[PDB]
Write an enzyme that holds these catalytic residues in place. Structure first.
Site, PDB file in Angstrom:
ATOM      1  N   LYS A  44      -3.563  -2.820 -22.921  1.00 19.54           N
ATOM      2  CA  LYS A  44      -4.197  -2.612 -24.215  1.00 19.54           C
ATOM      3  C   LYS A  44      -3.032  -2.247 -25.153  1.00 19.54           C
ATOM      4  O   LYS A  44      -2.244  -1.345 -24.857  1.00 19.54           O
ATOM      5  CB  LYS A  44      -5.219  -1.485 -24.148  1.00 19.54           C
ATOM      6  CG  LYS A  44      -6.196  -1.484 -25.308  1.00 19.54           C
ATOM      7  CD  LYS A  44      -7.226  -0.418 -25.116  1.00 19.54           C
ATOM      8  CE  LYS A  44      -8.218  -0.410 -26.247  1.00 19.54           C
ATOM      9  NZ  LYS A  44      -9.041   0.847 -26.208  1.00 19.54           N
TER      10      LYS A  44
ATOM     11  N   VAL B 195      -2.872  -0.730 -28.262  1.00 21.21           N
ATOM     12  CA  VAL B 195      -2.956   0.599 -28.867  1.00 21.21           C
ATOM     13  C   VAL B 195      -4.218   1.295 -28.358  1.00 21.21           C
ATOM     14  O   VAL B 195      -5.230   0.633 -28.078  1.00 21.21           O
ATOM     15  CB  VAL B 195      -3.068   0.477 -30.421  1.00 21.21           C
ATOM     16  CG1 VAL B 195      -3.044   1.852 -31.112  1.00 21.21           C
ATOM     17  CG2 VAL B 195      -1.958  -0.383 -30.952  1.00 21.21           C
ATOM     18  N   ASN B 196      -4.151   2.616 -28.213  1.00 18.73           N
ATOM     19  CA  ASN B 196      -5.296   3.421 -27.774  1.00 18.73           C
ATOM     20  C   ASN B 196      -5.012   4.870 -28.109  1.00 18.73           C
ATOM     21  O   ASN B 196      -3.902   5.341 -27.900  1.00 18.73           O
ATOM     22  CB  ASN B 196      -5.569   3.285 -26.270  1.00 18.73           C
ATOM     23  CG  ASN B 196      -6.798   4.070 -25.832  1.00 18.73           C
ATOM     24  OD1 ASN B 196      -7.932   3.693 -26.137  1.00 18.73           O
ATOM     25  ND2 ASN B 196      -6.579   5.167 -25.110  1.00 18.73           N
TER      26      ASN B 196
ATOM     27  N   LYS C  61     -13.001  -0.457 -40.405  1.00 15.27           N
ATOM     28  CA  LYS C  61     -11.972  -1.410 -40.808  1.00 15.27           C
ATOM     29  C   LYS C  61     -12.488  -2.825 -40.750  1.00 15.27           C
ATOM     30  O   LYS C  61     -11.969  -3.706 -41.424  1.00 15.27           O
ATOM     31  CB  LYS C  61     -10.710  -1.264 -39.953  1.00 15.27           C
ATOM     32  CG  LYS C  61      -9.986   0.041 -40.231  1.00 15.27           C
ATOM     33  CD  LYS C  61      -8.556   0.049 -39.702  1.00 15.27           C
ATOM     34  CE  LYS C  61      -7.722   1.126 -40.421  1.00 15.27           C
ATOM     35  NZ  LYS C  61      -6.338   1.226 -39.863  1.00 15.27           N
TER      36      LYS C  61
ATOM     37  N   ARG D  71       2.286   1.700  -3.573  1.00 14.25           N
ATOM     38  CA  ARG D  71       1.248   2.160  -4.478  1.00 14.25           C
ATOM     39  C   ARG D  71       0.873   3.622  -4.240  1.00 14.25           C
ATOM     40  O   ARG D  71       0.630   4.379  -5.185  1.00 14.25           O
ATOM     41  CB  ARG D  71       0.006   1.291  -4.333  1.00 14.25           C
ATOM     42  CG  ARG D  71      -1.251   1.903  -4.944  1.00 14.25           C
ATOM     43  CD  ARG D  71      -2.446   0.953  -4.892  1.00 14.25           C
ATOM     44  NE  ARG D  71      -2.920   0.735  -3.530  1.00 14.25           N
ATOM     45  CZ  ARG D  71      -3.746   1.545  -2.877  1.00 14.25           C
ATOM     46  NH1 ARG D  71      -4.206   2.645  -3.451  1.00 14.25           N
ATOM     47  NH2 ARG D  71      -4.122   1.249  -1.645  1.00 14.25           N
TER      48      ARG D  71
ATOM     49  N   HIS E 134       2.767   6.033  -2.248  1.00 18.52           N
ATOM     50  CA  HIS E 134       3.811   7.042  -2.149  1.00 18.52           C
ATOM     51  C   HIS E 134       5.094   6.823  -2.923  1.00 18.52           C
ATOM     52  O   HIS E 134       5.992   7.634  -2.832  1.00 18.52           O
ATOM     53  CB  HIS E 134       4.150   7.285  -0.682  1.00 18.52           C
ATOM     54  CG  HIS E 134       2.950   7.537   0.181  1.00 18.52           C
ATOM     55  ND1 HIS E 134       2.368   8.780   0.304  1.00 18.52           N
ATOM     56  CD2 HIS E 134       2.194   6.692   0.921  1.00 18.52           C
ATOM     57  CE1 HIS E 134       1.297   8.689   1.074  1.00 18.52           C
ATOM     58  NE2 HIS E 134       1.172   7.432   1.464  1.00 18.52           N
TER      59      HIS E 134
ATOM     60  N   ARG F  54       1.075   3.545 -27.769  1.00 22.32           N
ATOM     61  CA  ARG F  54       1.455   2.213 -28.235  1.00 22.32           C
ATOM     62  C   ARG F  54       2.418   1.461 -27.341  1.00 22.32           C
ATOM     63  O   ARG F  54       3.470   1.972 -26.981  1.00 22.32           O
ATOM     64  CB  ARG F  54       2.063   2.276 -29.637  1.00 22.32           C
ATOM     65  CG  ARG F  54       1.035   2.397 -30.734  1.00 22.32           C
ATOM     66  CD  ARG F  54       1.651   2.240 -32.104  1.00 22.32           C
ATOM     67  NE  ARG F  54       0.644   1.744 -33.032  1.00 22.32           N
ATOM     68  CZ  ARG F  54      -0.312   2.496 -33.567  1.00 22.32           C
ATOM     69  NH1 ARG F  54      -0.374   3.784 -33.293  1.00 22.32           N
ATOM     70  NH2 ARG F  54      -1.270   1.936 -34.304  1.00 22.32           N
TER      71      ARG F  54
ATOM     72  N   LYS G  23       0.830  -1.201   0.000  1.00 17.42           N
ATOM     73  CA  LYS G  23       0.000   0.000   0.000  1.00 17.42           C
ATOM     74  C   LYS G  23       0.869   1.258   0.000  1.00 17.42           C
ATOM     75  O   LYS G  23       0.577   2.239  -0.683  1.00 17.42           O
ATOM     76  CB  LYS G  23      -0.933  -0.002   1.212  1.00 17.42           C
ATOM     77  CG  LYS G  23      -2.089   0.950   1.071  1.00 17.42           C
ATOM     78  CD  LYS G  23      -2.663   1.302   2.431  1.00 17.42           C
ATOM     79  CE  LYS G  23      -3.934   2.114   2.264  1.00 17.42           C
ATOM     80  NZ  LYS G  23      -4.542   2.397   3.597  1.00 17.42           N
TER      81      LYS G  23
ATOM     82  N   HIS H 255     -17.000   3.934 -30.640  1.00 20.59           N
ATOM     83  CA  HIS H 255     -15.839   3.101 -30.912  1.00 20.59           C
ATOM     84  C   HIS H 255     -14.866   3.878 -31.773  1.00 20.59           C
ATOM     85  O   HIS H 255     -15.278   4.507 -32.738  1.00 20.59           O
ATOM     86  CB  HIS H 255     -16.296   1.803 -31.604  1.00 20.59           C
ATOM     87  CG  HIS H 255     -15.221   1.113 -32.386  1.00 20.59           C
ATOM     88  ND1 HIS H 255     -14.330   0.230 -31.812  1.00 20.59           N
ATOM     89  CD2 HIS H 255     -14.883   1.192 -33.697  1.00 20.59           C
ATOM     90  CE1 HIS H 255     -13.483  -0.200 -32.734  1.00 20.59           C
ATOM     91  NE2 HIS H 255     -13.797   0.368 -33.887  1.00 20.59           N
ATOM     92  N   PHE H 256     -13.590   3.895 -31.388  1.00 22.08           N
ATOM     93  CA  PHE H 256     -12.577   4.602 -32.173  1.00 22.08           C
ATOM     94  C   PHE H 256     -12.104   3.619 -33.246  1.00 22.08           C
ATOM     95  O   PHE H 256     -11.688   2.501 -32.927  1.00 22.08           O
ATOM     96  CB  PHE H 256     -11.407   5.049 -31.284  1.00 22.08           C
ATOM     97  CG  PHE H 256     -10.487   6.045 -31.938  1.00 22.08           C
ATOM     98  CD1 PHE H 256      -9.354   5.627 -32.622  1.00 22.08           C
ATOM     99  CD2 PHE H 256     -10.773   7.397 -31.901  1.00 22.08           C
ATOM    100  CE1 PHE H 256      -8.532   6.548 -33.261  1.00 22.08           C
ATOM    101  CE2 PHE H 256      -9.955   8.323 -32.537  1.00 22.08           C
ATOM    102  CZ  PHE H 256      -8.838   7.898 -33.218  1.00 22.08           C
ATOM    103  N   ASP H 257     -12.232   4.001 -34.513  1.00 19.32           N
ATOM    104  CA  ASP H 257     -11.824   3.117 -35.595  1.00 19.32           C
ATOM    105  C   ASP H 257     -10.391   3.302 -36.052  1.00 19.32           C
ATOM    106  O   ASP H 257      -9.639   2.320 -36.141  1.00 19.32           O
ATOM    107  CB  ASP H 257     -12.763   3.225 -36.789  1.00 19.32           C
ATOM    108  CG  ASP H 257     -12.691   1.996 -37.692  1.00 19.32           C
ATOM    109  OD1 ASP H 257     -13.052   0.881 -37.224  1.00 19.32           O
ATOM    110  OD2 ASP H 257     -12.273   2.138 -38.866  1.00 19.32           O
TER     111      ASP H 257
END
Lengths: 124, 124
Positions: free
Chosen positions: B41, B43-44, B66, B10, B12, B85, B7, B119-121
């Site tokens: 993930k 790619v975003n 796509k 996480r 400090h 990425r 803890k 949705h991001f294409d």
């Protein structure tokens, strides 16, 4: 469920001019580190030193914690820390923080076996 | 349960990351936005324009997604977005990302009534 529109907003929207700004450090870190769920943790310090150096604090100067407990120690030397504090404009769930980088001595509570820091008490 | 020791880290600890670093955006955002849970993930993309400007894409140029679906729309103007990425070094739960600021047209999928982005294409 999380609606498709709300999911899109979470996954892709970050409206602003300078999102990649260093002054945003606390907002993202306070979020990434889970301290903005349910409420906005008003104040929190991040330490930028090696974990070996922070763990070493458990064998340095002894001091009384702020709550009266006696298991606190103060670093012999100053450490590079980032202080995060809610702004006068922050209101959950829209938590906002001002980022401040300073060099101060850290005071932490140690516990467990081996003895490791288990609470950040204050900085001086 | 979570150990008091874990803890502390996480809450400090932030070694190996400097607040004054523009390159850190994706790592902090992918984590803040909960896209590093269970797996990184790959790619975003994050959009920095207004929510109003992005929702308006649903009334612009119709194109094919796509994946062959036909509910995709392309923005008329380029928008300010951030490309995230997974680095070759990335390894869950230690997800690493490269931050690339760009300005391209975005293609989103629209759904619901009223039709909003869901949705991001891709960007082009």
């Amino acid at each position: 469920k999380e609606s498709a529109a709300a999911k899109f907003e979470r996954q892709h929207m970050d409206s602003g001019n300078s999102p990649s700004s260093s002054s945003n450090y606390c907002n993202l870190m306070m979020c990434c580190r889970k301290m903005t769920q349910g409420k906005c943790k008003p104040v929190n310090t991040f330490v930028h030193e090696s974990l070996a150096d922070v763990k070493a604090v458990c064998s340095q100067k002894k001091v009384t914690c702020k709550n009266g407990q006696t298991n606190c120690y103060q670093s012999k030397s100053t450490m590079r820390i980032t202080d995060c504090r809610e702004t006068g404009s922050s209101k959950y769930p829209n938590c906002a923080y001002k980022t401040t980088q300073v060099e101060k001595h850290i005071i932490v509570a140690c516990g467990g076996k081996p003895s490791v820091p288990v609470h950040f008490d204050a900085s001086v």
